[PDB]
Every structure is written in C-alpha cells, then in structure tokens.
C-alpha cells in the first residue's frame, strides 16, 4: 500500500512551464465522438 | 437502481443455453466495458465477467460475455440448478459515478 | 484467501451512531478499492460507495453525498462504513467489496459475505 521503492502512485504531477516548449506545454483538446445506431439524428442545422 | 435494463426472470431445460440481455445509456455500457455478476439467494455476490469476456477466479467456462457497444449479453451454455441465482448486468461507470447494477436474471428449473 | 470479512447480525436502535467493520485479510489491503453496497431485502441490487483506503479518497453516490460516512483504515486494514443517524431504510443487508485490479478491469471479484443491520419492534 505505500509509495516508496519500484511503487510510485499511478499519477505523476504535470511538469508545465512557461519555459518549457509548445511541445512540452499543455494542450486543450476535444474528441468529438459519434455512433451511428438507430435513433434520430441529433445535432443538425447546417445544410439548408 | 441504475438504467440497466435486465430480464429479471428466466427458465429453460437443463443443457439449454439462456441469452441475458443487457443495454441502457451509452455512458454506462458503451463507455465502460460491461461486467457479469451472479448471487446466489441468501449470499453474496460474486463477479462473473469483466472486460466484456474475461473471467475472475471461481468463474465456469459456461459463462460468455459479448459487448456490442450500448448493447450485451450473457451466454450461458449447459444449465444445471447451480443457476437458482439472480444475474446482475453491472459496471463501475461514470455516468452517476457508480458501480451501477442491473435489474437481476433469476431462474428455475421446471 | 482473499476476503472482506464483515462482522454478525447487528441489531441498534435508529437515530444513533453505528460503525459498521470490514476486515481486509488475504491481500494487499490498499491495492484495491474497496466497495461498500446495500441489500434492502426484496429490491434489485443497490449501491452505497467505493473508497481507497490510503487516503479515505470515496467515489461517493451523488444522493447520499454526507449522509454515509465513510472512513477505510490501511494499518487495522479495515473499512469502516458509519452513519450517525440510523433510520428505518438502513435496514438491509449490507456487502463489502474487493475489485480486481490486479492486471485486469473495474469488476467486483472478491465480496464481503453479507451482514444485516435490524432494529427489532
């Protein structure tokens, strides 16, 4: 149950800096994700 | 009493090979890969199935899961009367930041 | 053998403080969350809770958010479900439960054997 030797916690703190570079910066990113199963199609406007 | 929905009473011959149905939302079981229980009446309960497929120790090779996203189902092959038992669908999910169960599959034999 | 040993049949009386205990033997104590779930009997399966023992860190249930107190110890390795305030509803049977995270998924492998909380009338 403790941390200590060849036992570290499953998360490790973010190491983020303005010095650090665009690739060593945080990203805020979006997945958008969609199924296609038999239901009305939800989110639709744009095409008329 | 989370949403998923579960046949709550099933039956069949001894060698017959029941079909348990299970769907919902699809952050419950579309999200987080669904899990098999059993509880025999009077007991505790006991995992049967996780990660769709894979079984803890204790658990007979009869018991088969599949997932098809929002939608599963529990194949169990060869009845005997060790299934006088509720089957629940179930998962930790984070849709109300749960282990979320179902409506429970108990069955007899006549 | 693997196992969250919980006490006998508790019988108290409603408005008070009760502990419950659950003893974590047979494992690695604080490798595994730890699942506290009801069993009002006669009712599809209910849940109450899931805790790590090193921090007392609880995915809690949204509508019982401080009405269960949850406490889980790592050196008496043992998950203490209390309420300070009993009721009617409390009356159930409740299980412990130890997930199966060794190299695998969020199932509920090992569970507690099951003790009923009962106020006699």
């Known amino acids: 149950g403790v941390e200590g030797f060849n036992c570290y916690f499953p998360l490790q703190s973010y190491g983020f800096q303005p010095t650090n570079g665009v690739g060593y910066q945080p990203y805020r990113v979006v997945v958008l994700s969609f199924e296609l199963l038999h239901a009305p199609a939800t989110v639709c406007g744009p095409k008329k | 009493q989370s949403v998923l929905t579960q046949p709550p009473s099933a039956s069949g011959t001894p060698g017959q090979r029941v079909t348990i149905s299970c769907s919902g939302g699809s952050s419950n079981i579309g999200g987080n890969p669904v899990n098999w229980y059993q509880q025999l009446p009077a007991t505790a309960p006991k995992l049967l199935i996780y990660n769709n497929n894979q079984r803890p120790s204790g658990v007979s090779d009869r018991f088969s899961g599949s997932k098809s996203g929002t939608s599963a189902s529990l194949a169990i092959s060869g009845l005997q009367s060790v299934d006088e038992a509720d089957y629940f669908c179930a998962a930790w999910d984070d849709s109300l930041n749960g282990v979320l169960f179902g409506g429970g599959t108990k069955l007899t034999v006549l | 053998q693997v196992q969250l040993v919980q006490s006998g049949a508790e019988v108290k009386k409603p408005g008070e403080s009760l502990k419950i205990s659950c003893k974590g033997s047979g494992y690695s104590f604080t490798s595994h969350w730890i699942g506290w779930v009801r069993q009002k009997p006669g009712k599809g399966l209910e849940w109450v809770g899931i805790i790590h023992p090193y921090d007392s860190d609880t995915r809690y249930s949204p509508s019982f958010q401080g009405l269960v107190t949850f406490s889980a110890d790592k050196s008496s390795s043992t998950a203490y479900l209390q309420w300070s305030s009993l009721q009617a509803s409390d009356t159930a049977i409740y299980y412990c439960?130890?997930?199966?995270?060794?190299?695998?998924?969020?199932?509920?492998?090992?569970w507690g054997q099951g003790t009923t909380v009962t106020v006699s009338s």
């Open positions: 439960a130890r997930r199966t995270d060794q190299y695998g998924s969020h199932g509920m492998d090992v």
